[PDB]
Curated annotation (Swiss-Prot), chain A:
Family per record: Belongs to the helicase family. RAD25/XPB subfamily.
Residue span of motif DEAH box: 126-129
Quaternary assembly: Component of the 7-subunit TFIIH core complex composed of XPB/SSL2, XPD/RAD3, SSL1, TFB1, TFB2, TFB4 and TFB5, which is active in NER. The core complex associates with the 3-subunit CTD-kinase module TFIIK composed of CCL1, KIN28 and TFB3 to form the 10-subunit holoenzyme (holo-TFIIH) active in transcription. An additionnal subunit, TFB6, plays a role in the dissociation of the SSL2 helicase from TFIIH after transcription initiation. Interacts directly with TFB6.
Signal peptide: none
Function: ATP-dependent DNA translocase. Component of the general transcription and DNA repair factor IIH (TFIIH) core complex. When complexed to CDK-activating kinase (CAK), involved in RNA transcription by RNA polymerase II. May have 3'-5' helicase activity alone, the TFIIH core however has no 3'-5' helicase activity. Also involved in transcription-coupled nucleotide excision repair (NER) of damaged DNA. In NER, TFIIH acts by opening DNA around the lesion to allow the excision of the damaged oligonucleotide and its replacement by a new DNA fragment.
Annotated transmembrane regions: none
Modified residues (Phosphoserine): 390
Residues of the full protein shown: 363 to 770 of 843
Note: Present with 825 molecules/cell in log phase SD medium.
The protein's name: General transcription and DNA repair factor IIH helicase/translocase subunit XPB/SSL2
From Swiss-Prot, chain B:
Signal peptide (UniProt feature, chain positions): none
Subunit structure, as described in the record: Component of the 7-subunit TFIIH core complex composed of XPB/SSL2, XPD/RAD3, SSL1, TFB1, TFB2, TFB4 and TFB5, which is active in NER. The core complex associates with the 3-subunit CTD-kinase module TFIIK composed of CCL1, KIN28 and TFB3 to form the 10-subunit holoenzyme (holo-TFIIH) active in transcription. An additionnal subunit, TFB6, plays a role in the dissociation of the SSL2 helicase from TFIIH after transcription initiation. Interacts with TFB2.
GO cellular component: cytosol; nucleus; transcription factor TFIIH core complex; transcription factor TFIIH holo complex
GO biological process, alphabetically ordered: nucleotide-excision repair; nucleotide-excision repair, preincision complex assembly; transcription by RNA polymerase II; transcription initiation at RNA polymerase II promoter
Family membership noted in the UniProt record: Belongs to the TFB5 family.
Keyword match Ribonucleoprotein: no
Top-level taxon of the source organism: Eukaryota
Function statement: Component of the general transcription and DNA repair factor IIH (TFIIH) core complex, which is involved in general and transcription-coupled nucleotide excision repair (NER) of damaged DNA and, when complexed to TFIIK, in RNA transcription by RNA polymerase II. In NER, TFIIH acts by opening DNA around the lesion to allow the excision of the damaged oligonucleotide and its replacement by a new DNA fragment. In transcription, TFIIH has an essential role in transcription initiation.
Name of protein: General transcription and DNA repair factor IIH subunit TFB5
Claim: Transferase is one of the keywords in the record: no
Species of origin: Saccharomyces cerevisiae (strain ATCC 204508 / S288c) (Baker's yeast)
SMART domains: Tbf5 (SM01395)
SUPFAM superfamilies named among the record's database cross-references: TFB5-like
């Protein structure tokens, strides 16, 4: 990819003594850039990752290059260990395993052999936006190499600590514009859209009488959000496109999941059921609407479903939802003549959550994506299958929300 | 057969509830509740009832975007 050689030209310029951060999309090949840099340096390279799936991907890249089984390419994890050799090495480690404090499973010595014997020379950190934390400062404080590299896709955080990475690892060298990359490769056009649904009177006065995170249980459970949600679901099913529903709250995800009758993936869920739901979403055309929480978004991103719906949200964590949204957008690439990606933000008027979703839309403006407002698409008035459209169901839902407030 | 002078206020139900909250905090504001989108309000407060509205929609909206 041209931008990858545009990033490698900086390494080809000076050669020795260099450190910086390279911003590349998730769908791009930053791991290939790490492989090329590993071929240019030829030394013990350590790749800092947070999940085993990324370790398996880096191992697959090592297989795409050459060798992995002979005593040279090592693997560090809490399950097994593998030997290494000087002058050339490729190993992937976990942040929580290298960090620690005093808990030990007779494996911290195996890491202190890679760090004690001084077999290093190249540092690779996956997702640098997570570095602003004490454990990563300890990791950097326990390592020292000749060349450092930071592979990440985003860096927008409101912790005011992203600027420290300019001296902890190095200043950002190349930031690729996702619009020009969309022109190089169709990574699904980004259509940002907020749905403005009216707010009922009872949920408005009860919403004002509530506060903190409890008023979210009155912002999400609005009947017009169920009507507009069903209208968007039936609309996308009529267009023949799969639907992914995001929710920062597990309770709302279970409510919409059970009321819509679709599979759901949330916390404390068996992994076999998660894999079954994933296979049903990949193969079965009857399941075109999945309800995914943060566990289903951080662990895996699927290239299907051009329809992304956002209902639940948390205060301040708008940039993280923009990063996950960006992961689902960049995950969809196949060079199509159309390829229209639709992001809907179900927001209710006069609520305290839309005013942060606007900050998320500001993050979506900083990336160059297109944003437009949507009050209501004509067609919901012709859907007799809408729930909570009658005053009876609205009063019953009001009583259910009041009971939910009495439980919390 | 009876006629009283007041101030007819026409607004959406949410703004109506907000005006009812103004009358709940300051009193001597709303004279009658006509329907879901109309209210009988003391005229000498209307401007205030307007201005306070702006204030309560300035505290609600926030959005500094800075």
């Amino acid at each position: 990819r041209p931008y990858q050689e545009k990033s490698l030209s900086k390494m080809f310029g000076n050669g020795r003594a260099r450190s910086g951060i390279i911003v590349l999309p998730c769908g791009a090949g930053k791991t290939l850039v790490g492989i090329t840099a590993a071929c240019t340096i030829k030394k013990s390279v350590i790749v800092l990752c947070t999940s085993s799936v990324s370790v398996m991907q880096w191992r697959q890249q090592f297989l795409x290059x050459x060798x992995x089984x002979x005593x040279x390419x090592x693997x560090x994890x809490x399950x097994x260990x593998x030997x290494x050799x000087x002058x050339x090495x490729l190993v992937v480690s976990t942040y929580s395993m290298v960090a620690n404090x005093x808990x030990x499973x007779x494996x911290x010595x195996x890491x202190x052999x890679x760090x004690x014997x001084x077999x290093w020379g190249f540092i690779i950190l996956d997702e640098v936006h997570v570095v602003p934390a004490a454990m990563f400062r300890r990791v950097v404080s326990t390592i020292a190499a000749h060349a450092k590299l930071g592979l990440t896709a985003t860096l927008v955080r409101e912790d005011d600590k992203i600027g420290d990475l300019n001296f902890l690892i190095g200043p950002k060298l190349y930031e690729a514009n996702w619009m020009e990359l969309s022109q190089k490769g169709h990574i699904a056009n980004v259509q940002c859209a907020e749905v403005w649904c009216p707010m009922t009177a009872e949920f408005y006065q009860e919403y004002l009488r509530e506060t903190a995170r409890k008023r979210m249980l009155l912002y999400i459970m609005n009947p017009t959000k169920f009507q507009a949600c069903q209208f968007l679901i039936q609309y996308h099913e009529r267009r023949g496109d799969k639907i992914i529903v995001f929710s920062d709250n597990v309770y709302a995800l279970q409510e919409y999941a059970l009321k819509m009758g679709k599979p759901f993936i949330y916390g404390s869920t068996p992994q076999q059921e998660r894999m079954n739901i994933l296979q049903n979403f990949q193969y079965n055309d009857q399941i075109n609407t999945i309800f995914l929480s943060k566990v289903g978004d951080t662990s895996i991103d699927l290239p299907e479903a051009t329809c992304l719906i956002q209902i639940s949200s948390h205060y301040g964590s708008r940039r993280q939802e923009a990063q996950r949204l960006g992961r689902i957008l960049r995950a969809k690439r196949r060079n199509d003549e159309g390829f229209n990606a639709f992001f809907y933000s179900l927001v209710s008027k006069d609520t305290q959550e839309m005013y942060y979703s606007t900050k998320r839309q500001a993050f979506l403006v900083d990336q160059g994506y297109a944003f437009k407002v949507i009050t209501h698409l004509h067609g919901m008035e012709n859907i007799p299958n809408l729930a909570y459209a009658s005053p009876r169901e609205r009063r019953e839902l009001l009583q259910e929300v009041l009971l939910k407030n009495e439980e919390a | 057969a009876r006629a009283r002078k007041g101030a007819l206020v026409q607004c959406d139900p949410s703004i109506k509830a907000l005006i009812l909250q103004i009358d709940a905090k300051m009193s001597d504001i709303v004279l009658e509740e006509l329907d879901d989108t109309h209210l009988l309000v003391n005229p000498s407060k209307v401007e205030f009832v307007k201005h306070e509205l702006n204030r309560l929609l300035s505290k609600n909206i926030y959005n500094p975007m800075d």
